[PDB]
Ligand binder design. Structure first.
Ligand SMILES: NC(=O)C1=CN([C@@H]2O[C@H](COP(=O)(O)OP(=O)(O)OC[C@H]3O[C@@H](n4cnc5c(N)ncnc54)[C@H](OP(=O)(O)O)[C@@H]3O)[C@@H](O)[C@H]2O)C=CC1
Ligand SMILES: NC(=O)C1=CN([C@@H]2O[C@H](COP(=O)(O)OP(=O)(O)OC[C@H]3O[C@@H](n4cnc5c(N)ncnc54)[C@H](OP(=O)(O)O)[C@@H]3O)[C@@H](O)[C@H]2O)C=CC1
Ligand SMILES: NC(=O)C1=CN([C@@H]2O[C@H](COP(=O)(O)OP(=O)(O)OC[C@H]3O[C@@H](n4cnc5c(N)ncnc54)[C@H](OP(=O)(O)O)[C@@H]3O)[C@@H](O)[C@H]2O)C=CC1
Ligand SMILES: NC(=O)C1=CN([C@@H]2O[C@H](COP(=O)(O)OP(=O)(O)OC[C@H]3O[C@@H](n4cnc5c(N)ncnc54)[C@H](OP(=O)(O)O)[C@@H]3O)[C@@H](O)[C@H]2O)C=CC1
Ligand SMILES: C[C@]12C=CC(=O)C=C1CC[C@@H]1[C@@H]2C(=O)C[C@@]2(C)[C@H]1CC[C@]2(O)/C(O)=C/O
Ligand SMILES: C[C@]12C=CC(=O)C=C1CC[C@@H]1[C@@H]2C(=O)C[C@@]2(C)[C@H]1CC[C@]2(O)/C(O)=C/O
Ligand SMILES: C[C@]12C=CC(=O)C=C1CC[C@@H]1[C@@H]2C(=O)C[C@@]2(C)[C@H]1CC[C@]2(O)/C(O)=C/O
Ligand SMILES: C[C@]12C=CC(=O)C=C1CC[C@@H]1[C@@H]2C(=O)C[C@@]2(C)[C@H]1CC[C@]2(O)/C(O)=C/O
Lengths: 326, 326, 326, 326
């Protein structure tokens, strides 16, 4: 009963239940050649959603993404391209959600992307130094300028998202259509409890990220930090610490148990985790990440796992994780 | 007492009581040469309204229409060009009334038409997957961008049209000026009963289509499906089935009777049917269709029939049709 | 105590108490060479206001005006250029105050004028076929598009002007700043009684036209229709009839009497009439007309007459005219 | 506890506590070479705020400023460029806060600056001939046109600033973010008493100017008008009169006393005065002025003085000045 394509929240924007992101990989960990192959595989498999950000690889991720789109020549109208704005430089005025950086940042992202507009522009995170009204007016402005079709939030609290809606309705501006939130077996609270309320109240959709907790859910770290793994990359010592932390090892213990259900269902752990992220209608789309073609094809195969996630299967997983939100 | 030119609803847009459409014919059933001749004949006879759609002939109808306008060099200010948006591609995001497709779709139609803007952009049909607010904001945006002068609805229910007005007045956006509805002797309810209410309440005008029920009213199918007829064209098996259906034959029976009044008045059946469509002020303009010059000139001659449609004549027709709405 | 420059109504637009119009003369009755000289004389004498219209000489007036501006190279910021829109073609959709013609009409005027925008765009007259809301939205749109700085009305009733303000305040649009009304010794009611109310209520300014009643006030028709006079021009038989009419001769009788006061003051009749038009603060600016340099220099000399228009002088004129409004 | 960078009022625009202005110097008193050096020194020292005006050196200040920015090639996103509009020509319509001059004036400033937009456009002073609504709509328009990111006021009373906010909230326009006010030891009332109220009430920020009272606070006029001093420049006889005035000499007397505290703290008088201007959070940024590199480097050194401005030090200064506002 799964519908591969669904509306992003209550907006009219239709997206595939699975998207492909560019964090770490594009313009960084992987070659442009591998990136091209990954996007082609995604696109050919129905995926129309591709996420990026001005900060990814200091802007190179957007460059690679734009190059592929141009080289492949896919119709712009058949793609949903999203980017996020917060950190776009070292200068004081090159970061934040001020009108100045919103406009300068998106303009610079579009130039790198070789695109006239993105379908959704996201505030990559909350800005405690900029009043909501200024931010909402700036997002509304770029949409009115044809630089984006819609806008959204990322890593914002339920209250801050409602605040953006409040400002939009008071000054007759455009409200946000989606919140890009982290969601995986070890981070469920926000997406399972809070976001559903925002959907029914103000139509906000949930586009989730890091469905494998940066690859931790794959269980490839059951025995240390494998070579070439994200956790072994430069600038990702923070990930390695989380993996080697006390809590990071307790997660591995639970994973081994989840692995049992995986093989018992005839799928891999990553496929179980990803399918798990889509088990509820509440999630509009799960943004995937992959360093090679084997991972992506495996991940996409998660769709076939959905039908096997019965009530019993879900309860067993909850008993194992032991973190089912109230 | 007929006024050849009238306002489209309560808007200031003045249109001829007869327009020329491009469905099936332009870029499809007829040659560009024949299309040029038909439009010239229309224009030279006072017709200033020409309708098309992104979906007609996969966009070719708009191409032919734009070519003629350019080749003939008529002043853009002397023309009322309308197009409709819903289905503009095979991709998921290439259909619907989302802001994304509204903007991408109209932009693509304008490029094909070689025009900077259309006078009216229509939503070709209702979109159950896009909230009215998003659609109304998108229509308002393209009007503000100078891509269209006004917007309208097509195949929308009275309630959905009122809903668009509601959103427009609540968020101070631009309301629709017209609804493009089917109207002929075998489809009267909506146009005769509901649309008049929308005109007096929210100024919505009625621009009607298929005045001959795709040619069925001409009675050329009194004996099967004549060669080259629309019903015998590829992709129009649906029309042939309606003609050969039980109800389709009962219509022919009534037509034969209507034919009596036609010849009794000194006009053809198509002229009687078309003049009938304009008998009431409620209809701002009737969109004509034609595959050759004989049909168009005949159709235009319907204007001369109007004066003969007395109360008695109208009552006789009602008795024959037996479908006068309450 | 006269201030040569004053605000046009309550707006911030500052105009000279005297402007130079282009009706009949520019691109028509006079040569481009004479037009250039007249504008230069005006500009050099402090006049910054120049009025035209899409209908004047079928658009040639705007062409000549734009040529002079370009040839002389005066700073655009030192000029106040106004044009009026209603009749811009023979086609049905080429006339009126519909959004379509407002945009097409002004765009075409600007191209002829070789200007990016006019300071004020006027609706040349009321349009009974277009709802006020559509007209006000269209004027607001062109101002927002940078095609005009402000907009105004011409030949509108006090109630229709208040209606435009009503729509502007209800839908948060831009209200009109001025009404271009006829004003001379034989047409005082509207300007003296009604316009002052609009100024204090909604800040509307009064820019008056035909201060010499098309030249009739000069008294050059005291003995028929002199050669080369406007009344003897082709297409102005209507003016000749008004002059030769019973009322037209009764005006001449009164003029002869006014002539007495003129010579008694040391000025010409035209100078007395023009100075009379500016005697009250209510009039922001009087638009002058002239076929040669002698008339213009004479007319401009009306400024020196103002100081002599005492209460007694004004009362004597009222006794003669006998048309002082209540 | 000083934060070099702070928000300009409640807006999201982040500026350095010290800015560099161009009045008198750029394109005038100093060479383009010296101007380039001064800006480079400022920029390299963290200063991101540079102020100018259409009136400075008849537009040359903006030309020099734009040349430096272009020659140095600093990222536009790392700069906060502000300009002020009021007097942009000799013609009547070339001055004021009318929509006409706002648009023409800023457009001309941007061309001279070789920039697409300024971060903040200021009304250089109040305009008693233009209604607030017109001015606020014009500022909102240029911001919506991408010609400026924000707008502000300069030399406006607290009530006039609140009036601009009132109009903005009534017609849903954009309110001002900052007021550029004079602030130095001999002008404290407005900035110390009134502006703080506007900050808490409507978020208006305080960007101050002439922190050395045009150089008077430096005490270089303790013995007349030194050569090359601003007071000895052409067109600045007004400054010399203020210095040589009775009150101007009484200020010198107080300065000599302040000098005691300066040397007693280990800093110069200008450093004490400038640091004094930043002692309170109320001031977002102090705009500096300098004719040579020695002055600028000295002035910037005022930051190190801030830590020494204890309560006692501030009280001693108040006792000396004897002008502490109520
Ligand atoms: N809004 C925001 O702030 C954020 C948004 N995002 C978005 O979400 C997207 C996805 O996030 P991401 O963290 O990459 O997602 P995941 O948590 O799914 O991690 C994907 C990474 O895990 C590894 N992996 C993937 N599949 C497999 C597999 N089958 N077997 C083994 N290892 C596998 C790969 O890394 P390796 O091979 O190197 O181990 C890959 O790069 C991003 O690209 C971005 O677009 C992400 C973070 C934040
Ligand atoms: N908003 C919407 O969804 C829709 C809008 N429209 C608009 O309305 C327009 C008119 O619709 P359309 O269905 O073409 O109109 P009609 O119902 O009037 O049918 C016209 C067709 O009937 C035949 N015909 C026309 N005149 C004669 C005649 N005198 N004698 C015999 N046959 C005749 C021709 O087909 P043939 O010779 O092949 O038999 C011609 O193509 C369209 O072109 C389009 O612009 C149409 C449908 C939907
Ligand atoms: N909003 C609207 O609908 C209208 C606006 N206007 C505006 O107002 C302007 C002025 O109107 P207009 O009717 O021309 O003004 P006047 O009533 O002042 O008439 C001017 C004409 O009278 C004659 N004249 C002028 N000065 C003298 C003189 N000193 N001695 C003798 N004859 C003289 C000239 O015509 P001749 O030498 O041929 O006798 C000249 O063309 C127009 O150009 C236009 O811009 C005008 C009409 C309508
Ligand atoms: N909004 C508005 O209406 C106004 C805004 N402003 C803005 O504020 C900025 C600063 O104003 P400004 O009056 O120049 O500032 P100051 O009051 O600080 O005076 C600076 C001037 O004083 C002298 N000076 C500076 N430092 C020293 C020093 N250490 N020792 C001795 N003399 C020194 C220099 O002049 P010299 O060497 O010639 O003596 C220099 O040009 C302007 O450039 C402008 O951007 C200014 C006025 C009005
Ligand atoms: C998609 C939309 C309009 C286009 C856009 O850029 C952002 C949004 C977000 C909020 C949506 C809004 C609508 O279109 C109407 C909605 C969906 C509203 C939330 C409640 C709402 O007002 C409602 O429930 C319809 O009545
Ligand atoms: C034409 C118009 C404005 C231009 C446009 O793009 C769309 C519309 C549709 C609705 C119209 C509106 C008007 O202009 C004023 C009308 C005609 C309104 C319906 C009721 C109305 O408000 C009225 O009755 C006047 O008072
Ligand atoms: C000039 C202006 C704004 C710019 C414009 O394009 C048209 C107008 C016309 C109406 C003016 C308006 C104002 O600026 C404020 C005014 C002048 C208003 C009439 C009453 C008003 O609201 C008032 O009295 C101030 O309080
Ligand atoms: C920065 C801002 C919006 C961007 C802009 O161009 C100008 C302003 C000035 C007024 C600010 C406004 C806000 O962003 C919200 C503020 C800061 C408001 C003053 C009160 C306010 O409404 C408030 O207190 C938040 O609730």
């Amino acid at each position: 009963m799964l519908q591969f394509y669904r509306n992003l929240g209550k907006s009219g924007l239709r997206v595939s239940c699975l998207g492909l992101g560019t964090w770490v990989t594009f313009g960084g960990q992987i070659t442009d050649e591998m990136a091209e192959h990954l996007m082609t595989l995604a696109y050919d498999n129905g995926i129309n959603l591709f996420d990026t950000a001005e900060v990814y690889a200091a802007g190179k991720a957007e460059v690679v993404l734009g190059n592929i789109i141009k080289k492949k020549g896919w119709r712009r109208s058949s793609l949903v391209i999203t980017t996020k704005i917060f950190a776009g430089g070292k200068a004081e005025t090159e970061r934040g959600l001020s009108r100045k950086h919103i406009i300068e940042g998106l303009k610079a992202s579009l130039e790198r992307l070789q695109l006239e507009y993105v379908d959704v522009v996201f505030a990559n995170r909350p800005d405690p130094n900029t009043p909501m009204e200024e931010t909402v007016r700036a997002m509304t402005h770029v949409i009115n300028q044809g630089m984006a079709m819609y806008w959204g939030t990322s890593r914002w609290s339920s209250m801050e998202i409602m605040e953006a809606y409040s400002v939009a309705r008071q000054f007759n501006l455009i409200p946000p259509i989606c919140e890009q939130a982290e969601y995986h077996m070890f981070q469920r609270e926000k997406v399972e409890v809070q976001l559903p309320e925002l959907f029914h109240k103000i139509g906000v959709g949930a586009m989730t990220w890091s469905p494998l907790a940066c690859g931790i859910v794959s269980g490839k770290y059951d025995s240390g930090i494998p070579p070439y793994s994200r956790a072994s990359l430069k600038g990702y010592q923070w990930l390695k610490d989380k993996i080697l932390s006390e809590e990071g090892r307790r997660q591995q213990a639970k994973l081994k148990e989840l692995q049992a259900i995986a093989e018992r269902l005839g799928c891999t752990l990553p496929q179980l985790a990803i399918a798990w992220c889509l088990r509820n209608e509440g999630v509009s789309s799960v943004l995937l990440g992959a360093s090679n073609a084997e991972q992506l094809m495996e991940n996409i195969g998660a769709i076939q796992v959905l039908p096997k996630l019965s009530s019993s299967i879900v309860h067993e997983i909850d008993s194992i994780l032991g973190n089912k939100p109230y």
